[PDB]
């Protein structure tokens, strides 16, 4: 729910050096931008808390982003799968409702 530039992400990561964080910690940038540390990784283990150094590959995933869907309407959309379902029937009955339920959750 806030627009960060790429340089804004770089500056926020630069401010997050030599400082230890933990899971679900609400960081703040410019007293309005809200963060959430949902995952700290080290040697293949999801540690509860970790230390952020100079060579830490910090990523900025977006929980409110613009999305583009490109559905192919082809001759195969009305074809039947081996179980007995059309592919567009799958698209409108199991992909979109599940992804909207997941997005709401």
């Amino acid at each position: 729910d806030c627009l960060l530039n790429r340089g804004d992400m770089w500056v926020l990561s630069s401010k997050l050096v030599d400082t230890c964080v933990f899971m679900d910690q609400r960081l703040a940038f410019l007293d309005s931008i809200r963060g959430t540390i949902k995952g700290i990784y080290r040697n293949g283990k999801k540690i509860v808390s970790g230390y952020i150094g100079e060579q830490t590959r910090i990523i900025f995933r977006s929980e409110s982003a613009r999305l583009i869907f490109l559905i192919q309407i082809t001759d195969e959309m009305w074809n039947f799968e081996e179980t007995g379902e059309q592919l567009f029937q799958k698209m409108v009955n199991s992909f979109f409702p599940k992804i909207f339920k997941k997005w709401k959750d």
């Binding site: 195969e76 039947f80 081996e82 179980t83 007995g84 379902e85 059309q86 029937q89 009955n93 199991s94 409702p97």
Partner: protein, 405 residues
């Protein structure tokens, strides 16, 4: 075949008068046929541990298939709204093909009810709702009649939703005991079945299928890994099109089977056998000496029964060569017709234990094949060498015997 539906009805959970049959087609079929909605009412509308599952039970002589669905939201009265599209079949059938269709119908109507309350507002009763914050019968009629007549439906229920059900037969999974020494046949013409949607490997396997190419030979010819060839051959077996066979040699121990009387009891087997085993012209192979106009059906029947368990094909051909020369019979086609009709079989050869210097990998796979008691065919395929060289290599490695089973 597909079993016809006996009775379709739509149950619903009324928050005051309980579970009941809201709509049913044909009308009053359950009461006329003896089915009572007071014995299995706890399975049609169950507690929410059995919900969202394909409940199927037996009631007398009728097998009942249903997919109960329960939606949890504060909008509905009592925080729940349960319904069930129940399908009833006679017990003495197979309800396997209709099960994914019933599950998908229940799932689709659950999705629509969660989206825009298509099934709850159709009751036209505010008792289903909290009250503080399309015809089902025609749809059931169309579903029942279209699944009884056409096994398909494109039934519209709204401006953007349609009940699209197609019923497919259930096919057995293919074998897993397919190896590199088995030649695949093709009972169907695979040239006209190829379309744009095929696997790239299965496109390449099709030209090299003629009843005499081994699976490793197909893999090497089409530049394919043997594993994907195995999977593609399994897929072709899955549709009942390709049947495996044996590599044809002149050192085989072909013997009559228990179906050799089918060459007399089948009116259309010997007639095709006359035309099948004959060369198109007077071929020169029917003119070579032993050492230096179509065939009679009785001759073919006498030649089929002349094989025995221990007489190799070389000995049988050099013991019966005037008959296969005057009648102009192709011996490979002669054997292949008998193998295809399952009237003769092959006694496999087993090198059980008791030359150029081959490589370390060759001797390693030779030892691994010997330890697993593999046939001479598999050893010959893996070493890419004939039977005599394999026998000489084994005799150099140790004493052994051949079992013709």
């Amino acid at each position: 075949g597909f079993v016809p539906i006996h009775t379709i009805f739509y149950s619903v959970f009324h928050p005051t008068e309980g579970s009941k049959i809201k709509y049913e087609f044909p009308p009053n079929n359950l009461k006329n046929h003896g089915i009572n909605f007071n014995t299995f009412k706890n399975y049609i509308i169950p507690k929410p541990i059995l919900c969202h599952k394909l409940i199927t039970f037996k009631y007398g002589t009728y097998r009942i298939v249903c997919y109960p669905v329960t939606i949890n939201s504060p909008i509905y009265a009592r925080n729940f709204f349960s319904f069930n599209f129940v399908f009833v079949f006679p017990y003495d059938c197979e309800t396997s093909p209709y099960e994914p269709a019933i599950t998908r119908l229940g799932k689709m109507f659950k999705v629509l009810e969660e989206q825009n309350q298509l099934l709850s507002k159709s009751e036209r009763d505010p008792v289903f709702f909290d009250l503080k914050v399309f015809s089902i019968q025609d749809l059931l009629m169309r579903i029942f009649q279209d699944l009884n007549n056409y096994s398909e439906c494109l039934i519209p229920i709204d401006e953007g939703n349609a009940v699209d059900i197609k019923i497919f037969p259930l096919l057995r999974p293919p074998t897993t005991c397919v190896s590199l020494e088995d030649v695949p046949l093709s009972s169907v013409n695979l040239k006209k079945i190829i379309d744009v949607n095929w696997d790239p490997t299965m496109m390449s396997i099709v030209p090299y299928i003629d009843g005499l190419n081994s699976i490793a030979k197909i893999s090497k010819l089409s530049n394919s890994d043997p594993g994907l060839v195995i999977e593609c051959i399994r897929h072709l077996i899955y549709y009942k099109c390709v049947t495996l066979s044996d590599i044809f040699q002149f050192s085989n121990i072909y013997a009559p089977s228990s179906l050799i009387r089918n060459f007399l009891t089948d009116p259309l087997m010997a007639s095709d056998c006359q035309s099948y085993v004959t060369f198109p012209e007077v071929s020169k192979i029917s003119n070579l000496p032993l050492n230096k106009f179509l065939p009679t059906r009785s001759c073919l029947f006498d030649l089929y029964r002349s094989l025995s368990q221990g007489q190799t094909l070389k000995t049988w051909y050099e013991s019966k060569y005037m008959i296969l020369k005057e009648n102009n019979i192709d011996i490979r086609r002669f054997i292949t017709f008998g193998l295809e009709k399952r009237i003769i079989y092959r006694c496999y050869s087993f090198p059980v234990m008791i030359m150029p210097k081959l490589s370390d990998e060759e001797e390693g796979i030779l030892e691994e094949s010997i330890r697993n008691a593999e046939t001479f065919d598999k050893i010959c395929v893996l070493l890419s060498k004939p039977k005599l060289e394999v026998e000489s290599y084994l005799n150099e490695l140790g004493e052994f015997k051949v079992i013709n089973s």
